Amino acid sequence: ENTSENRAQVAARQHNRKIVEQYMHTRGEARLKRHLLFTEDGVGGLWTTDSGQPIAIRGREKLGEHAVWSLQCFPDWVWTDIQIFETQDPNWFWVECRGEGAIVFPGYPRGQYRNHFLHSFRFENGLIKEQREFMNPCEQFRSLGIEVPEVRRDGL
Amino acid sequence: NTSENRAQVAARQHNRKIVEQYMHTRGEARLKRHLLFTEDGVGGLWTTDSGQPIAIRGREKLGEHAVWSLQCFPDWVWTDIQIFETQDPNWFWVECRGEGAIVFPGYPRGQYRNHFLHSFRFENGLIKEQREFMNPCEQFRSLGIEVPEVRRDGLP
Numbered sequence: 001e002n003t004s005e006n007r008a009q010v011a012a013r014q015h016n017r018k019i020v021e022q023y024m025h026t027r028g029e030a031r032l033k034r035h036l037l038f039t040e041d042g043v044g045g046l047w048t049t050d051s052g053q054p055i056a057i058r059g060r061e062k063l064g065e066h067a068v069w070s071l072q073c074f075p076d077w078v079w080t081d082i083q084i085f086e087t088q089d090p091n092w093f094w095v096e097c098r099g100e101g102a103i104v105f106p107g108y109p110r111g112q113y114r115n116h117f118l119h120s121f122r123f124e125n126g127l128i129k130e131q132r133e134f135m136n137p138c139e140q141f142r143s144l145g146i147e148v149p150e151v152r153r154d155g156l
Numbered sequence: 157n158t159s160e161n162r163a164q165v166a167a168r169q170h171n172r173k174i175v176e177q178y179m180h181t182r183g184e185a186r187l188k189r190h191l192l193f194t195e196d197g198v199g200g201l202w203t204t205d206s207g208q209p210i211a212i213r214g215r216e217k218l219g220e221h222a223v224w225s226l227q228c229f230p231d232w233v234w235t236d237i238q239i240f241e242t243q244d245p246n247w248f249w250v251e252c253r254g255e256g257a258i259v260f261p262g263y264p265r266g267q268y269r270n271h272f273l274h275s276f277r278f279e280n281g282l283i284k285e286q287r288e289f290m291n292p293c294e295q296f297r298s299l300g301i302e303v304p305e306v307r308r309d310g311l312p
């Protein structure tokens with residue numbers, strides 16, 4: 001039905017989608033200002049790590065500080081093949097994409113990192129309250145020259 | 157309130173019940189879950205140590221692979237299930253946890269727990285593509301397989 005509440009849900013979803021689009025297309029020096037898309041207390045980070053616990057960066061200003069690190073470690077990163085999924089919750093989106101770029105971690109050789117990624121984006125008052133990245137850490141191991149453990153799958 | 161929109165709302169409602177049934181299937185019922193798929197439907201694991209998916213193609217193959225997975229994961233349960241509808245009535249995402257005994261040939265019996273994202277694409281009210289995304293490092297741990305530790309220097 002065309003009710004005021006349905007219209008507000010649509011307007012919210014439309015505004016939030018634009019912010020996900022902006023986030024996913026932010027490159028180069030603009031990455032240093034991407035934290036401004038978050039709530040003051042917004043969280044972002046990497047939910048799939050070798051330790052099994054997330055690396056969560058808490059707060060808009062922490063996210064900005066971290067972005068200085070990221071731009072060194074991934075100096076030319078781009079997201080590609082971006083597919084944005086709206087959900088029944090106008091404040092929750094998922095993205096499936098790929099990503100490629102140089103990886104420059106201290107203690108490892110410089111390499112070329114490519115992966116497939118899923119991102120979750122939760123909004124509040126039109127700003128990102130929680131962003132989470134999910135990927136396969138094994139691909140990042142390969143990019144760093146770290147030997148990837150193998151699972152034998154007998155009888156599969 | 158057009159019949160196009162009405163067709164889509166029903167498609168989505170129907171597909172969501174299929175996703176619910178899939179996610180709640182346990183025990184011997186797992187032997188018949190393949191019946192939820194199109195004849196040519198594909199299921200499998202998109203996040204693997206090799207970087208390549210383990211794609212199980214076809215309803216009959218899916219039913220055959222269920223026999224092996226009921227040996228390897230005899231008491232598997234999905235929990236904490238959150239279903240996400242999308243703008244496509246034939247595309248859903250699920251975020252959930254899962255755990256169970258892991259009983260692979262040639263590895264100590266373990267307890268495997270992980271966080272999962274599942275993609276479900278439909279055609280004609282059945283599953284045409286199911287894809288599981290997880291952190292393989294957690295499966296390594298469950299099998300006693302050593303997991304390398306990525307050092308993140310400069311990380312605040």
Ligand SMILES: O=C(O)c1cc(Br)ccc1N[C@@H]1CCCNC1
Pocket residue numbers: 031034057063064066067068070071074077099133
């Ligand atoms: O892209 C950035 O600006 C960025 C900013 C923060 Br803060 C953390 C990580 C970042 N980028 C990496 C690229 C490789 C895949 N993981 C995310």
Ligand SMILES: O=C(O)c1cc(Br)ccc1N[C@@H]1CCCNC1
Pocket residue numbers: 186187189199212218219221222225226229232254288
């Ligand atoms: O649960 C099933 O019946 C099942 C069926 C097929 Br065919 C393949 C794998 C299965 N289970 C594993 C459990 C641990 C996480 N990955 C999925």
Ligand SMILES: O=C([O-])c1cc(Br)ccc1N[C@H]1CCCNC1
Pocket residue numbers: 152153154155156199200201210224225228260261288
């Ligand atoms: O490891 C998984 O969770 C898994 C997921 C999907 Br789908 C299919 C097969 C899987 N594992 C095989 C490994 C070899 C022994 N049989 C179980």
